[PDB]
Amino acid sequence: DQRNEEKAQREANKKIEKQLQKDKQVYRATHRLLLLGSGIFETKFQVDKVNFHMFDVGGQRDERRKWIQCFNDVTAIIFVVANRLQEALKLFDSIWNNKWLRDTSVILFLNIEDYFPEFARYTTPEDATPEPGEDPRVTRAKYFIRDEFLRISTASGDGRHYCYPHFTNIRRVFNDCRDIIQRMHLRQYELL
Amino acid sequence: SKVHYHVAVIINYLGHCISLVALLVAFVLFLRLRSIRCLRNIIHWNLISAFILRNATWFVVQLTMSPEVHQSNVGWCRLVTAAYNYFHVTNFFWMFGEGCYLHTAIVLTYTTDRLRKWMFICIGWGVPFPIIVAWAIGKLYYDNEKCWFGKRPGVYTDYIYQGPMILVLLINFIFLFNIVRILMTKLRASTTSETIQYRKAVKATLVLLPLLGITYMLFFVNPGEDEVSRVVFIYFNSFLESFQGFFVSVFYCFLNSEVRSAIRKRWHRW
Amino acid sequence: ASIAQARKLVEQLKMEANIDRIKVSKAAADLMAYCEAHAKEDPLLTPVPASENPFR
Amino acid sequence: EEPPISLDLTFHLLREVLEMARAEQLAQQAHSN
Amino acid sequence: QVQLQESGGGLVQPGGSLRLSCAASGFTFSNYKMNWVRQAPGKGLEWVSDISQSGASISYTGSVKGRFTISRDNAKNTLYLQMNSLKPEDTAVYYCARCPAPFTRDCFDVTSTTYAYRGQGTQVTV
Amino acid sequence: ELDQLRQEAEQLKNQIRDARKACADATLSQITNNIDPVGRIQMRTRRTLRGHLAKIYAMHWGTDSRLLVSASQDGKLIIWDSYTTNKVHAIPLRSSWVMTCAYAPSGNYVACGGLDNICSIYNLKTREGNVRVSRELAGHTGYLSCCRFLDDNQIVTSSGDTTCALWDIETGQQTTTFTGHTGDVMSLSLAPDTRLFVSGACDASAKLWDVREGMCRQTFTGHESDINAICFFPNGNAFATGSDDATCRLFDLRADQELMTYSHDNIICGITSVSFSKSGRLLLAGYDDFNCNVWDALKADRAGVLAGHDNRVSCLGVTDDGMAVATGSWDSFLKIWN
Fold this sequence. Notes:
- The complex is a heterohexamer.
- By secondary structure, chain B is mostly helical.
- Chain B has 14 helices and no strands.
- Chain B starts with a helix and ends with a helix.
- Chain C starts with a helix and ends in a 19-residue tail after the last helix.
- The interface between C and F is large, with 40 and 62 residues.
- The PDB classes it as membrane protein.
């Protein structure tokens, strides 16, 4: 029947569309994170009743130029840093300047005098806020590494995405993703 | 003494005309572009519609009133006054819906997903209905005269629909106080020059005045006892009230960078 | 060392150097003959009437 | 005596002309007394 | 076919100079940002220097600043690396890496995994 | 042996280069110079399928030209009815990042794969009335870029670990492994007779494979960047490729070389999708600048534009009767043109 085979097809469609509405509520309530630096590992933690979803890439090859444009709509890319420092400065340079990751913010977690010759003539800024106990050798190194990543961030920021460098917490990711969403809302209203 | 009253009604005609043509252009661009339609643009679209329904009704109140109909107190006179008062209250409950959205999206930021589209349609269009109905109930019993917009001293019946309108202006002021407060902390961290940080915090607290309805609070009431001040009150409030639909359609539909770029793409296709 | 990948490239480049190749004119004339013989069966090439169009 | 507020400006301008246009058309009738 | 053939190389005394060349073929040389990548014996691939599509935004690694200078010639499709005052820790196989997409500012061309758009390397011994 | 084989390897590169130029007696753009061009083809959006929450990476038409499967990165696999725009199925996937989807020629199964390195086979026609995952083809070591059914019990998949694989679905083990690529195999295309298939990888190379034997027959170079898309000519004697270099190219399986190049000066964005019309005269290609460009496959002349998407066009497919073209995009919409 031409009429009963379309009503039974619209009866199934309305059941599909009312389930996609429930899935849309869970998809928007969850914030997707990409931990960078099976085939993919999921970590579903929750901070103050806010659902987060971190995705460590796991068992992929060293070539990221293709599977990394998958994570262009994540809230933030968590970039863990541990020469291995210049290789992480070039990997941050590509993620920052990628045409698809140009709207994705990066939360930077930072876990040497020969690899960087400009470290000799580098003085710790007076704006530095260290906790007491750190000798001026490690505090000057913690802020020099941070000033290398902020040099990449302030060269091509343009106001679409921001870098949140830290030292080493999930509370910092909770506080940094809220700053990412707030700036995203202020940009839609052109208040920023 | 009477010359400035005839000049103020011209600003209203000049204002409610430029606003109505800017609101109608803004009205089509919102359903013409299905892509830009989101909860933020849906609340914006419903505000444009409520402004058109009030600007259109304002012309009906301006043409179909006269000292003959005013004294007549005819049935269709009390219906266009209660229709204008409804579309005027739906303006404030839709400027409040844009307040509680932008406030939640900035000051809460994690309860924004709890906000549903039906919550704003119910407040913008639905809540003003018991307000105007209860206004006409108290207007048909007490103070049923002069097409329902004649003010008699000591009655205080128009406060049934002006009470909620005043309360919305106070809550929308607490919202605007937090939005610009949070935005300023976002500017100290991203900008170095403090002069530019004020060129953006003043530009943002000015484009949010017609959106949240604060222009009714700039010069709210006049102390009186001076004909000089009574002229400014009429002129300053006839320019803000009439040109409000023009302001919210220019910055939030026309100069909206997303709509600006989205309608350019429709031009590269011709 | 890792010459098993540099050697296996040779016996693969050997098998690709023995295939039969026809002239590109004889190969491009076959693509025309296929397009010229299936041109009326292409609803996107020749516009399909609204009568027998299932999407309009 | 009551001061006008910004929310009631439309019907204030209307109430002002409806007692101003009524008195000026009374002037041309005042000639006829 | 993308073909990058490196030349120069050779054993040199500590403190001596050396000029590396890179003959590119199979692609429009002007549209790509070219890199230099080395691999010390025992370590993995590490990035040395890059240069923009025109030759304006030049970049080096900290260990070679003031000594190496990269230069390209878009008119003849050749990338250069003048290595001045070499020291014994500059002994490695130097590859002429090209990053995969044209008209872009991002490159992913140091992968330990087989990377396609780089040469076979020229041995430099100090 | 460490470098005397590199010297011998280019002795065959220059021998194959000379056998390909000796047979290049003409040019496809020279012998099709007298045929009449196609008119300005202005296809309009007939349907717009909405319901995906996130980007759409893949779609595939059914053989009945009515149903089409779609894969979005929000974790859903929606089966549509293109005539009615009604969702027939909505399969929630276990992994959220799926980069491909296939439709069985029987219409009974759909495949799906992505960053989980697993190809899931979903049984659509189950007796208990639901879509359940029947098999999970695991063991491919890299993200799945493409998958294509051969039968109801046989499927070819390409993976980001530079390896294509041929799977027996009922037992779940690879029956053949197609190695030889240098970079991530990004796409694959089956021949109309399903005896051969072609694959493009991130090494700017395309290889013609034999499904039965398992060898690489021919290698097709000519692109400058990673090949993102691939598709056979309707007669299976040629194929077209799409690359990040912003060009498309047509290769002939018998001439063993590139025939025509489809590039434009105003085009500096990569081609994400490549598909042929039913006759093979048109060549629809999705791009990064959010619109599709219909080409004249015989004259390399830009014949039309499908500009209706708000974000990057990801997938593109023509029906088996050539009636309509469906394109998905990162704006989460499927637009059907005609």
